[PDB]
Amino acid sequence: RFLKVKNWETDVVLTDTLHLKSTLETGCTEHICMGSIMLPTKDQLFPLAKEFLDQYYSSIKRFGSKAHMDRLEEVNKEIESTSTYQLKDTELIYGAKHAWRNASRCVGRIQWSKLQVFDARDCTTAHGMFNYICNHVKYATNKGNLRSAITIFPQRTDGKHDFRVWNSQLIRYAGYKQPDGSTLGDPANVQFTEICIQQGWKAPRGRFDVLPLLLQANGNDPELFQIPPELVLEVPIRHPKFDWFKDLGLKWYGLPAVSNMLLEIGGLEFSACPFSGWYMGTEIGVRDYCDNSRYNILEEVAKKMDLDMRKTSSLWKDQALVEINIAVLYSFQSDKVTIVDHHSATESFIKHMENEYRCRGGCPADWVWIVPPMSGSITPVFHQEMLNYRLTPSFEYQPDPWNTHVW
Amino acid sequence: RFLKVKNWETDVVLTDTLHLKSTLETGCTEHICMGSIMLPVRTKDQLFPLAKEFLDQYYSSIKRFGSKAHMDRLEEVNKEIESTSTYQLKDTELIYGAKHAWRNASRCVGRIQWSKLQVFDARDCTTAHGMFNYICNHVKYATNKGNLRSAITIFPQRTDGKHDFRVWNSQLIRYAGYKQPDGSTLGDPANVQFTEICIQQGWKAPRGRFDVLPLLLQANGNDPELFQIPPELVLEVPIRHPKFDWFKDLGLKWYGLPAVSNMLLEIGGLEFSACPFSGWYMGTEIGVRDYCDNSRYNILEEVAKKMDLDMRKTSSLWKDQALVEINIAVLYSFQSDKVTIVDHHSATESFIKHMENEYRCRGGCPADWVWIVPPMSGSITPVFHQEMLNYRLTPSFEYQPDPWNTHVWKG
Ligand code: HEM
Ligand code: HEM
Ligand SMILES: Nc1ccc2ccc(CNc3cccc(F)c3)cc2n1
Ligand SMILES: Nc1ccc2ccc(CNc3cccc(F)c3)cc2n1
Ligand SMILES: C[C@H](O)[C@H](O)[C@H]1CNc2nc(N)[nH]c(=O)c2N1
Ligand SMILES: C[C@H](O)[C@H](O)[C@H]1CNc2nc(N)[nH]c(=O)c2N1
Ligand SMILES: [Zn+2]
């Protein structure tokens, strides 16, 4: 019941008690592990609020206090009365920082307590949402010196008045299906680049067109807004050796801002809560650039390197994969835009695990996601045993709006 | 109950029913996943159902389920158990069990080869000397002058746990590790503790960077004995790089035959504590883990220095770069010497095909994603994007405690 994790590279053993506070489920059973599966009323609400408020008041060392008991009382009243309740700004901030702290798939959590929270709960319209999002983007971008932020739109009420950002990230590149049959731009966003035009967007049919925001306020039809280009920081990608690299025509945006997730605090559901940090270099160079179902530029880059692409045994994909990732990092760094390499970030995570085990008694972590998509075993996390479990507050996945929107 | 796995690269969805025939536990619960934990004397009481379960499996495979031959064999085994408290497998059953243990090995990317396993029945063995002979023959057969063949040699099953056959080596062929007084290590740091035991057991160590360890062999629960594998039987490959001529001068070589000797084979409740098995290497095993792990030979530094890389900032990816060339060198050297080896791209690609075939013909293929995905270049192999289900089927290979920790010394 009191669990240990061993690091096989350093013999360091940590003991995990935190997992016993776990409330949600994993998909796994004693008979089968689903560790590699990508996505496995008034009554419900007060215990949920209670547990949250209890951990909140314990964190400020006022567990079992007047204010504590009073707040529980006050929240208990408001639920009984209104069937929902509203968070204090203090609780909202604590809640958000903690959903990030608890995101078992996030390698970047060492920075969890340094989140800028923007309370956008007074928002009523898509234009309103657009305004808050532009403010978020400008604030987080910070001329290249990136700062983590989240902007929180009103909480779900009856699932009819939902606030939703339809973009999966605030900033993504368009992708267009061709008569040629191939794909121009980012193939991940073909369907979204369609719905944008299917709702009125005028695509400049390019390779790296910044997609328009599709914003849904109070469960209404979504509206298209173009983010001011001067707010979208992009990095042209060159290699610190191969000057043919610039010719490839590649760039990427500085601000990774995940916008499709659902933030759950004390039972309350924030369906629109776009958040942003900064990139680990592999996200762009390994996944965004070299994934088969993405920009898949491996074959081209290898050719330009004149590699023996005849046999897989030459490891030409590996060679190029490395150079590509060297270039992403080099471009960002030279352009003074925040980025972290997978070595630095994984090392930071181990230190953070150490810290969390020490000061909190554990740190939930999904090894399948924490290990970088390249050079896995030359990073410390590879040899780190991890325990995966779900704590609240949390970020959860949620259905794509176009499958759900009661139009 | 049906279960589905999706490949996010190809959108291929598959349906698992095989997980239903799963008995053993995972370590996971509804409230915690222990998917990245490395490792999470038996009565007749529970022996009959394990025997029966196995024999039912066996007679279905040969399409004789419920036949008279099936029934009599159940009766035969039942009788032998209540009379003797254990039982003996037929040759046919032993061969079936060993192959299926491999087929069920959820952490093995090489399972496409599962049905082509050479089973050596060493159950008539009685002494360490006999064990040495059987192993010598295994090594020679499997090695096959560089054209490697999968084999497993099976020594007598456990009885009371006091007469165990064990091979004390973790692999039949492995290099010595020596701790120096200055704290540096000479050779393979993975094998320091085992090297010490050997030395204490009377081994005269050459103390070089690539000394082949002697076999330490335990028969019938007696104290282990030291044997030197004939060097002519140990096939080795000098590591060079196709473009880098300074690479030969690094002084590296590796042995051709990966032959794991410390696992336990379970078949119908029977426990085979000595069952060394061998296949061939995937390049990354040597090139990534054996050479470049910090806790191993750890040559990244020296290789990177010789390539003149920027080693001042980690963001130069010098480690990543040096890692690739080292793995290129391993593949190149092995192929150049006509010693069987497989690259991680070929191996994972073949595994996806095997896995798909298994879902179709068997209703599933248990797979441990954490182990199946190669330790470099993960997402540029098809297994990375492949959802998998992990569950335990028998027959199976299991871990077991190191013998020096449990052994009662005779003297
Ligand atoms: C500040 C620097 C940050 C870095 C370097 C970072 C890094 C990463 C990486 C590499 C992943 C793997 C995702 C993938 O490969 O597709 C990830 C996932 C994730 N991150 Fe972080 N992150 C950062 C900030 C944040 C912030 C500010 C939040 C929330 C407020 C957050 C929450 C999450 C969540 C919930 C996931 C998993 C999402 C899912 O399940 O799909 N991260 N992060
Ligand atoms: C024939 C070519 C083979 C290849 C290329 C291959 C490949 C691999 C690799 C790369 C691993 C991961 C081990 C690590 O990274 O440390 C593994 C694990 C494993 N292999 Fe295979 N293998 C082969 C044959 C065999 C055979 C013949 C058997 C048994 C008869 C076997 C049984 C296992 C088992 C039980 C594991 C899991 C070990 C553990 O849990 O520690 N393999 N294999
Ligand atoms: N660098 C970062 C920072 C935060 C992240 C949060 C989530 C994810 C997961 N990727 C993701 C999830 C949903 C939509 C999407 F477009 C990407 C990656 C991150 N990557
Ligand atoms: N190429 C192969 C073939 C079979 C294998 C079987 C097991 C393992 C796991 N590694 C291992 C297990 C026990 C001792 C040891 F030294 C290595 C790797 C394999 N690697
Ligand atoms: C913690 C984790 O279980 C451990 O480091 C694993 C990771 N995956 C692995 N995968 C393979 N193939 N071989 C290994 O030794 C390991 N080590
Ligand atoms: C099948 C598997 O769950 C899927 O490909 C995962 C593997 N690990 C990952 N890890 C990260 N960081 N991001 C991902 O998208 C994925 N994809
Ligand atoms: Zn699990």
Side-chain angles (χ1 to χ4, degrees):
Chain A
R1 177 189 163 106
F2 286 42
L3 295 177
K4 305 233 193 70
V5 288
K6 180 181 176 182
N7 177 283
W8 291 78
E9 195 198 334
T10 67
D11 284 315
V12 174
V13 175
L14 306 166
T15 319
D16 185 291
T17 34
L18 176 65
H19 72 285
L20 285 169
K21 300 188 192 283
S22 168
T23 168
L24 292 160
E25 283 168 55
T26 63
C28 297
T29 82
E30 311 95 16
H31 293 329
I32 171 159
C33 175
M34 305 227 173
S36 67
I37 306 301
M38 255 215 48
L39 18 99
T41 81
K42 292 196 186 192
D43 276 324
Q44 308 146 334
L45 186 47
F46 188 68
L48 282 181
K50 179 172 175 49
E51 164 221 331
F52 173 70
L53 291 165
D54 284 342
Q55 60 181 84
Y56 173 65
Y57 273 104
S58 161
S59 73
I60 65 190
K61 306 185 311 175
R62 276 175 145 72
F63 192 86
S65 82
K66 194 80 204 334
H68 185 181
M69 298 312 140
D70 288 335
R71 179 54 170 159
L72 247 59
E73 182 184 292
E74 173 183 40
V75 166
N76 201 9
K77 295 175 195 293
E78 182 175 334
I79 295 168
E80 288 283 3
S81 170
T82 65
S83 78
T84 174
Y85 76 103
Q86 306 288 329
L87 290 177
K88 292 278 175 257
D89 297 6
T90 54
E91 301 156 353
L92 178 73
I93 291 152
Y94 171 91
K97 286 175 171 189
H98 278 258
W100 180 11
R101 203 188 184 172
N102 295 340
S104 71
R105 297 181 155 169
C106 179
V107 72
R109 291 177 273 164
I110 192 174
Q111 285 279 311
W112 77 270
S113 61
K114 313 196 266 297
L115 184 59
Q116 186 54 229
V117 178
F118 291 119
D119 189 345
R121 290 178 288 170
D122 61 356
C123 194
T124 68
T125 70
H127 280 87
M129 302 175 64
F130 174 66
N131 186 42
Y132 272 109
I133 290 175
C134 289
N135 290 356
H136 182 131
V137 168
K138 183 165 199 171
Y139 172 82
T141 301
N142 191 42
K143 295 183 178 304
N145 190 7
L146 305 197
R147 300 181 285 192
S148 300
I150 180 168
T151 296
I152 307 179
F153 292 102
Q155 69 210 44
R156 169 178 281 127
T157 50
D158 48 23
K160 253 47 182 178
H161 306 56
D162 271 22
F163 287 77
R164 291 296 300 269
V165 173
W166 289 37
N167 309 63
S168 44
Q169 296 166 37
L170 298 183
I171 306 172
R172 294 198 77 164
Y173 296 121
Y176 317 92
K177 279 176 173 296
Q178 296 280 54
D180 172 40
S182 60
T183 292
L184 181 69
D186 197 328
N189 298 313
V190 165
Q191 183 186 17
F192 185 75
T193 313
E194 282 196 273
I195 300 191
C196 286
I197 311 175
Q198 191 210 152
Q199 275 270 113
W201 195 51
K202 163 208 41 193
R205 277 182 111 95
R207 200 201 195 185
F208 293 149
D209 300 336
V210 184
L211 280 162
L213 289 169
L214 227 219
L215 301 188
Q216 172 188 318
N218 222 33
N220 304 324
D221 287 338
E223 310 180 21
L224 280 176
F225 303 95
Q226 163 182 107
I227 303 174
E230 64 265 20
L231 302 189
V232 180
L233 170 51
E234 292 173 285
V235 183
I237 307 301
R238 60 276 187 191
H239 194 284
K241 192 126 286 79
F242 315 130
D243 303 336
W244 51 260
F245 205 80
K246 80 190 86 295
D247 279 337
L248 282 146
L250 312 168
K251 70 182 153 179
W252 205 255
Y253 48 97
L255 194 76
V258 162
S259 57
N260 58 6
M261 299 199 79
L262 190 153
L263 168 62
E264 186 198 63
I265 297 158
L268 303 175
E269 301 198 314
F270 301 91
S271 50
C273 59
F275 58 85
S276 69
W278 57 82
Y279 269 121
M280 179 156 78
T282 53
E283 293 182 84
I284 308 171
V286 188
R287 301 312 306 288
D288 297 325
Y289 280 168
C290 296
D291 257 26
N292 245 282
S293 55
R294 296 300 288 287
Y295 277 94
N296 195 36
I297 63 167
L298 277 178
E299 294 189 51
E300 296 94 302
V301 175
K303 266 150 61 177
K304 284 251 171 77
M305 297 175 66
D306 230 317
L307 301 172
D308 190 11
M309 304 166 50
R310 292 184 274 188
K311 315 171 303 86
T312 71
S313 344
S314 71
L315 306 196
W316 62 267
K317 288 187 178 181
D318 315 74
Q319 281 188 268
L321 179 64
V322 178
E323 300 299 332
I324 294 183
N325 282 259
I326 289 184
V328 166
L329 297 177
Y330 173 75
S331 298
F332 270 61
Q333 286 173 166
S334 290
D335 284 5
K336 251 60 56 44
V337 182
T338 303
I339 202 174
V340 66
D341 66 72
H342 56 292
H343 299 292
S344 175
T346 53
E347 186 212 8
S348 292
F349 188 72
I350 297 285
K351 189 185 160 195
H352 172 57
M353 264 187 83
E354 247 114 69
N355 290 338
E356 292 288 74
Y357 273 88
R358 192 165 45 87
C359 313
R360 195 187 183 192
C363 173
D366 184 337
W367 189 105
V368 167
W369 282 65
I370 302 295
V371 176
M374 78 182 253
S375 297
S377 73
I378 52 162
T379 72
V381 284
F382 185 90
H383 319 262
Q384 185 66 63
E385 286 184 342
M386 304 167 192
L387 288 167
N388 197 25
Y389 49 93
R390 316 223 314 163
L391 300 176
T392 234
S394 65
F395 295 106
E396 307 285 15
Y397 299 93
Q398 80 187 323
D400 284 329
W402 51 92
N403 309 339
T404 330
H405 191 23
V406 272
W407 277 78
Chain B
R1 223 192 313 103
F2 284 173
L3 289 179
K4 311 167 316 143
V5 292
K6 161 181 188 163
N7 187 290
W8 290 81
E9 194 184 17
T10 70
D11 276 281
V12 168
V13 187
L14 303 165
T15 313
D16 190 290
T17 51
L18 186 55
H19 71 274
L20 292 173
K21 304 293 176 178
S22 151
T23 69
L24 307 181
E25 281 168 348
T26 66
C28 301
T29 74
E30 291 78 359
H31 282 108
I32 198 153
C33 179
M34 309 221 306
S36 72
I37 315 297
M38 152 150 193
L39 37 110
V41 57
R42 167 175 278 161
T43 53
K44 48 189 37 162
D45 221 278
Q46 75 269 64
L47 185 55
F48 299 106
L50 296 183
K52 187 185 181 304
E53 180 194 5
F54 171 73
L55 296 164
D56 290 338
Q57 296 175 251
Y58 173 74
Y59 277 88
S60 300
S61 68
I62 68 165
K63 301 204 173 180
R64 297 294 191 269
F65 185 94
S67 66
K68 177 155 182 304
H70 188 195
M71 294 298 110
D72 293 338
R73 181 57 181 148
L74 278 184
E75 247 301 286
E76 194 184 20
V77 169
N78 185 23
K79 288 223 61 248
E80 189 174 340
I81 290 168
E82 59 179 19
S83 174
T84 80
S85 252
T86 182
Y87 70 108
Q88 297 307 312
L89 293 175
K90 309 306 216 183
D91 293 2
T92 37
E93 301 164 348
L94 183 78
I95 294 153
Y96 170 92
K99 295 192 183 196
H100 284 260
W102 181 8
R103 188 180 187 182
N104 292 336
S106 67
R107 293 178 165 179
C108 182
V109 68
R111 284 178 282 163
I112 197 178
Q113 290 285 336
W114 80 267
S115 68
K116 296 147 192 185
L117 173 66
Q118 179 55 235
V119 181
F120 291 117
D121 187 346
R123 287 171 306 163
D124 61 11
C125 188
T126 71
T127 68
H129 272 92
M131 289 181 67
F132 173 70
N133 188 59
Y134 268 110
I135 290 181
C136 275
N137 293 341
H138 177 134
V139 168
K140 192 170 178 161
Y141 174 90
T143 299
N144 192 24
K145 287 165 151 195
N147 191 12
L148 269 50
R149 300 184 278 203
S150 304
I152 180 181
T153 294
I154 306 162
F155 292 111
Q157 66 215 43
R158 177 169 299 157
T159 46
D160 60 347
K162 290 177 165 195
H163 299 74
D164 281 8
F165 286 65
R166 296 294 296 279
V167 172
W168 287 33
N169 311 62
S170 56
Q171 289 172 32
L172 299 177
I173 298 164
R174 269 202 129 172
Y175 299 120
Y178 310 96
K179 202 67 166 302
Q180 308 283 69
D182 61 15
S184 66
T185 310
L186 172 54
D188 194 341
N191 304 323
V192 168
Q193 188 194 2
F194 179 74
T195 300
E196 287 169 337
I197 293 185
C198 289
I199 295 181
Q200 165 178 6
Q201 293 311 312
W203 187 48
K204 292 298 176 280
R207 307 192 60 88
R209 192 150 80 112
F210 293 104
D211 309 329
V212 176
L213 284 160
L215 293 169
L216 189 49
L217 305 181
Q218 163 180 320
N220 201 41
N222 300 296
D223 293 354
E225 319 185 354
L226 283 171
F227 299 89
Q228 181 215 151
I229 309 174
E232 63 259 37
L233 260 45
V234 183
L235 174 51
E236 292 182 294
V237 182
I239 312 310
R240 57 278 191 191
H241 193 284
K243 314 223 313 299
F244 299 163
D245 189 63
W246 52 258
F247 204 100
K248 68 175 176 299
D249 294 321
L250 285 176
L252 304 170
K253 50 162 171 174
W254 202 255
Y255 45 93
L257 183 78
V260 166
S261 51
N262 66 3
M263 297 192 78
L264 181 153
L265 163 60
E266 167 167 339
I267 302 173
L270 300 187
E271 297 179 321
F272 300 95
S273 52
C275 60
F277 57 81
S278 63
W280 53 80
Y281 271 114
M282 185 166 73
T284 47
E285 298 188 77
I286 304 156
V288 187
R289 311 307 309 290
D290 302 336
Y291 283 164
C292 296
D293 275 17
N294 293 332
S295 65
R296 303 295 296 275
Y297 277 86
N298 183 33
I299 61 177
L300 277 183
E301 291 259 357
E302 196 190 358
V303 173
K305 283 213 231 283
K306 292 254 188 300
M307 298 175 61
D308 195 51
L309 298 178
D310 192 331
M311 298 175 60
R312 275 185 287 98
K313 54 188 220 310
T314 78
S315 61
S316 71
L317 301 203
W318 66 265
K319 275 188 188 171
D320 306 67
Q321 282 193 285
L323 175 60
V324 167
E325 305 293 321
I326 286 163
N327 277 271
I328 291 186
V330 167
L331 295 170
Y332 174 69
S333 293
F334 266 64
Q335 297 169 358
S336 283
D337 281 344
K338 302 185 194 67
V339 183
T340 302
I341 194 165
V342 70
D343 66 81
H344 51 287
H345 301 290
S346 179
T348 53
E349 177 173 341
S350 290
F351 176 83
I352 288 297
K353 298 165 162 188
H354 162 67
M355 185 192 177
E356 286 173 354
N357 183 65
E358 290 278 81
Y359 269 79
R360 290 179 172 100
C361 83
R362 196 188 193 198
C365 182
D368 184 348
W369 190 105
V370 168
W371 277 65
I372 295 295
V373 183
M376 72 181 286
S377 303
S379 63
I380 51 164
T381 67
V383 297
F384 184 97
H385 311 267
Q386 177 67 63
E387 289 185 344
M388 307 174 182
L389 292 169
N390 197 23
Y391 50 91
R392 296 170 58 175
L393 301 168
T394 53
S396 68
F397 291 112
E398 298 297 340
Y399 293 121
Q400 63 187 327
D402 294 320
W404 52 91
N405 289 329
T406 65
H407 187 63
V408 174
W409 286 88
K410 272 52 178 181

